[PDB]
Amino acid sequence: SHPLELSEKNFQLNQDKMNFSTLRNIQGLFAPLKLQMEFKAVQQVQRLPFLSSSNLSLDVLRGNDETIGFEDILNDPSQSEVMGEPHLMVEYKLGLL
Amino acid sequence: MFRNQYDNDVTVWSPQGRIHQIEYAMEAVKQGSATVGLKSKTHAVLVALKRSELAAHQKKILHVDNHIGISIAGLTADARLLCNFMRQECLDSRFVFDRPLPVSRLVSLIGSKTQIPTQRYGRRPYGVGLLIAGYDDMGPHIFQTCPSANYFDCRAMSIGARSQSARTYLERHMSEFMECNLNELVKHGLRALRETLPAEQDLTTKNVSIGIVGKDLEFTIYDDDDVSPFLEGLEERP
């Protein structure tokens, strides 16, 4: 489609990865480990896939609380215009699909 | 009695100050049968006491790569997982570096593999001890692993069921082994295996597998009546 397609698709991946690299190299192995364990715990707390979820704990742990991007303000996913079956959506998240 | 509260997780300590579910995995070695493992300067022998005749063929001794294999005493799901892991380690050592994998190193890889579970919730200790016998540049090897993530280097050992009998034999003749042949070292291993057996029972080329690697020798699992020739020479339970 476009170069930016994938640069934006994996934007967050290929940033927090770089954060963990920096912390490994300066602070130590512990510093990524600690941040990772917090993030995964607070993104085991959201709604089922099929309802649009407000993950205040994960956002403020990243420092996104006080920062907007195009991610937020384009292609509004909270008024998603294409949703599936509740049960089948949840199965996909579980990895039964 | 108080250990009640703290024995049912692998990621909880007790007031007493010990994780009991790792000690229970180290009791689950004993639910599997008596493997012996003993080495010389030329060869590293294993033997296995195979607990129907038609059903449950029971493959106690397993071959990992040319230079290396194991025998199994305890949980068999875990035995499989651990062996298969080692096969991959050695495959990759001979794919990238195009050499064998040190036995010490491969037992250390299994060590850390088996520590993750014990220090993790939703996990349990691999409930099996191995006798990990390879040959390197170094010379022959035996390496006991425990169901607990800790492990040993050995020149002789037995793990499994009523296996103290074997351990005792292997201390009595520990010195012989260093300077034995292939077949001498094997009969020594089999006499440890026979010390474990009741006196009413015997080896009778039936409950005998023999897993020998060495200098030019590759890890070869003698079973059924490929163990007959080794047991030819062995004589006189007395």
Binding site: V45, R47, S54, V60, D65, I68, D76 | -
Partner: protein, 233 residues
């Protein structure tokens, strides 16, 4: 009976059909720092009691009355940590709304969105509700507005209300006092007096804080202004 199993978990209903972790997060609210919202003719007042009344405190640091956009702010009783992260979010959603609709977020709209955060945090398991309630006021469409969002995420428009401590006493005094036509020059005094009902000490620019909405928009009253209102009452 004790029925304590039901009163630990926030995902359970009780035998009779109660959600009890909600009620205990509203108990955290109901042991809060007295606030009073009085939506008056010429804007709203959010006159509140400060959880510090100390010789040792930096006046410029902490604010009970925070703006979200120009024209909106809010005040709280219950939890400070919780309040602060909820209003970081509030500000985000106001600016998202102004990048989508280019309209300063209506007080009602913002209230819905911050109460939809509250909705999620009672819904899910392995979290707690927020132990804080929000008097989100502000001025739109030539009109004053006051609301009251909850731990649960139920929100309701108000002419006059109170939360925190002696807060039912607050609303009793304020039912006797508040007039529909009461304008904001007189509502700040009324809110100061509703605090006097739910106060413990001597009341000063230090020991309370006030902040008001208007035609103009939302602000906090300067220590000077607050003590001048206390001197005028």
């Amino acid at each position: 009976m004790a029925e304590r199993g039901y009163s630990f978990s926030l995902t359970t209903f009780s035998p009779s059909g109660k959600l009890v972790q909600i009620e205990y997060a509203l108990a955290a609210v109901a042991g809060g720092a007295p606030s009073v919202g009085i939506k008056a003719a010429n804007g709203v007042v959010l006159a509140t009691e400060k959880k510090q009344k100390s010789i040792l405190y930096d006046e410029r640091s902490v604010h009970k009355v925070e703006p979200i956009t120009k024209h909106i702010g809010l005040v709280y009783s219950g939890m400070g940590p919780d309040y602060r992260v909820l209003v970081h979010r509030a500000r985000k959603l106001a600016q998202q709304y102004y990048l989508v609709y280019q309209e300063p977020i209506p007080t009602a709209q913002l209230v819905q969105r911050v109460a939809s955060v509250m909705q999620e945090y009672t819904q899910s398991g392995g979290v707690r509700p927020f132990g804080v309630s929000l008097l989100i006021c502000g001025w739109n469409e030539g009109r004053p507005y006051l609301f009251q969002s909850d731990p649960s995420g139920a929100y309701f428009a108000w002419k006059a209300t109170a939360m925190g401590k002696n807060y039912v006493n607050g609303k009793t005094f304020l039912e006797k006092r508040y007039n529909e036509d009461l304008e904001l020059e007189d509502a700040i005094h009324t809110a100061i007096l509703t605090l006097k009902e739910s106060f413990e000490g001597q009341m000063t620019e230090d020991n309370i804080e006030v902040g008001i909405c208007n035609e103009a928009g939302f602000r906090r009253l300067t220590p000077t202004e607050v003590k001048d209102y206390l001197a005028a009452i």
